[PDB]
Amino acid sequence: VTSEQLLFLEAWRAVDRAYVDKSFNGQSWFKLRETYLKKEPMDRRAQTYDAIRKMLAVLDDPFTRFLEPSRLAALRRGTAGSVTGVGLEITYDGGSGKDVVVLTPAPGGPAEKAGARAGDVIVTVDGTAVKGMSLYDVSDLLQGEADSQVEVVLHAPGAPSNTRTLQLTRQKVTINPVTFTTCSNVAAAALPPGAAKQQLGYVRLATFNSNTTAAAQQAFTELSKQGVAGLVLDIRNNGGGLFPAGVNVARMLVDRGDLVLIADSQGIRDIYSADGNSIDSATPLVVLVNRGTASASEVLAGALKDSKRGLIAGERTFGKGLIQTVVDLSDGSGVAVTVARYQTPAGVDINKIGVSPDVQLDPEVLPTDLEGVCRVLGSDAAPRLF
Numbered sequence: 106v107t108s109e110q111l112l113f114l115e116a117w118r119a120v121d122r123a124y125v126d127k128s129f130n131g132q133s134w135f136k137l138r139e140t141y142l143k144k145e146p147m148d149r150r151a152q153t154y155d156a157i158r159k160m161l162a163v164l165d166d167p168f169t170r171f172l173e174p175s176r177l178a179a180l181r182r183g184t185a186g187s188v189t190g191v192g193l194e195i196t197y198d199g200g201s202g203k204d205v206v207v208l209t210p211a212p213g214g215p216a217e218k219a220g221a222r223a224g225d226v227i228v229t230v231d232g233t234a235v236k237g238m239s240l241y242d243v244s245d246l247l248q249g250e251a252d253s254q255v256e257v258v259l260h261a262p263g264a265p266s267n268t269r270t271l272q273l274t275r276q277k278v279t280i281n282p283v284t285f286t287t288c289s290n291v292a293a294a295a296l297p298p299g300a301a302k303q304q305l306g307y308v309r310l311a312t313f314n315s316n317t318t319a320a321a322q323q324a325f326t327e328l329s330k331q332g333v334a335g336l337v338l339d340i341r342n343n344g345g346g347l348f349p350a351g352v353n354v355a356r357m358l359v360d361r362g363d364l365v366l367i368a369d370s371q372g373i374r375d376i377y378s379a380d381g382n383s384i385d386s387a388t389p390l391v392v393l394v395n396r397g398t399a400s401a402s403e404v405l406a407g408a409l410k411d412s413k414r415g416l417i418a419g420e421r422t423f424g425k426g427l428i429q430t431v432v433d434l435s436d437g438s439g440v441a442v443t444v445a446r447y448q449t450p451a452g453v454d455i456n457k458i459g460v461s462p463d464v465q466l467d468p469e470v471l472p473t474d475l476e477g478v479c480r481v482l483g484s485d486a487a488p489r490l491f
Contacts, residue, residue, distance in 0.1 A: 112150075119432035125442075127370045141159075167201065167203060169441065169442050174438050176241060177433070177438060184278075189276055191255060192211035192218075193227075196208040196240065198226070199424060207225045207226075208425065209399065220271075225259040225262065226261075230257050231256050232256070248275065252274060257273060259271065281311065282313070282320055283310055283320035288304065289304050290304075291482050296335060296491065298389075298491060300334035304332075304334050305333055307339065308328070328385070335391065335491065337391055337482075340398050340405065341393050341397060344399050345425070347401065351402065351405045359408065364408040365404050365407070368446055368448050391491055392405075392417050393468075394418075394468075396422065400426070403425065403455050406460040416464055418490055419464075424455065426446050426448075426454055426456030427446050430442055
């Protein structure tokens with residue numbers, strides 16, 4: 106058994122131990138290992154990496170991927186300094202043809218400013234066809250030094266002929282996780298039943314990151330103090346992000362009860378529940394979501410819905426409910442492995458199914474800027490949120 110073979114075995118073991126489906130897509134995992142050791146060339150590092158990728162592929166899970174040393178390091182630094190993108194979060198088509206699509210455009214980032222919307226399908230990046238490539242590889246094509254440009258060709262969902270070519274300039278993108286306001290003189294259409302004041306509290310939660318919790322706490326607190334008639338939590342176009350901040354937010358609204366189950370082929374592995382630290386669990390709440398709402402955001406929405414704490418309004422969410430971990434290998438390379446999936450308190454998978462609105466509404470009727478929101482909600486054309 107060679108050094109190259111041991112390295113391969115490290116990758117095989119990472120999956121053997123942690124993979125979400127212990128039936129391995131119907132493959133005999135140990136048998137594969139023995140077969141590859143015997144039939145696959147692993148004379149140089151490069152061959153070993155290819156053999157690892159080949160093995161991962163049999164799982165038919167495009168999120169389970171191998172990362173070479175430099176890539177893993179870069180993944181780690183992420184979009185921090187010197188490394189910039191164009192304000193796109195990407196993922197694979199929801200019916201996955203290996204089509205890469207825009208999960209969500211970052212608010213005010215380059216791609217959004219150039220008209221890109223959640224659900225658009227990415228055809229090429231700098232001429233390269235992205236269908237079926239690793240998302241880690243695709244991001245690499247999308248990223249680069251600030252002020253540099255990249256060409257992205259996109260089409261409308263289910264309209265391959267409806268394309269556009271954008272020349273985007275890479276720039277740092279800064280999403281402010283939370284903004285909020287009180288809307289006064291709200292239209293009757295937009296109020297919850299039995300409202301005693303025509304005022305609504307609006308909270309735009311654009312991303313879950315390190316700053317989300319502290320900012321959301323301040324918003325709910327203030328709003329509660331104002332005695333608003335209803336709360337409008339806006340998580341449209343929020344790709345998820347920091348799972349714990351989504352849990353923290355859920356905990357601000359619900360006093361008791363399960364929030365999310367973590368499951369895999371074995372059954373439920375972990376649960377997160379309310380911790381009695383609510384800020385506001387009584388004001389009527391409506392949560393706005395759309396096809397750009399994904400992952401931690403969907404989890405939030407699903408806990409609010411199942412618990413009956415809030416109504417979901419808008420359009421069905423993405424259905425991005427898998428969880429991956431990156432397992433480091435001895436040579437600095439790594440494997441991103443799907444280890445689990447999110448389920449609602451009711452035990453339904455978020456994956457694929459997403460979270461459906463109780464109130465179907467055109468997801469573009471309401472703006473996301475504080476001024477515009479109050480304007481529309483005070484209008485004769487206010488959405489019937491509740």
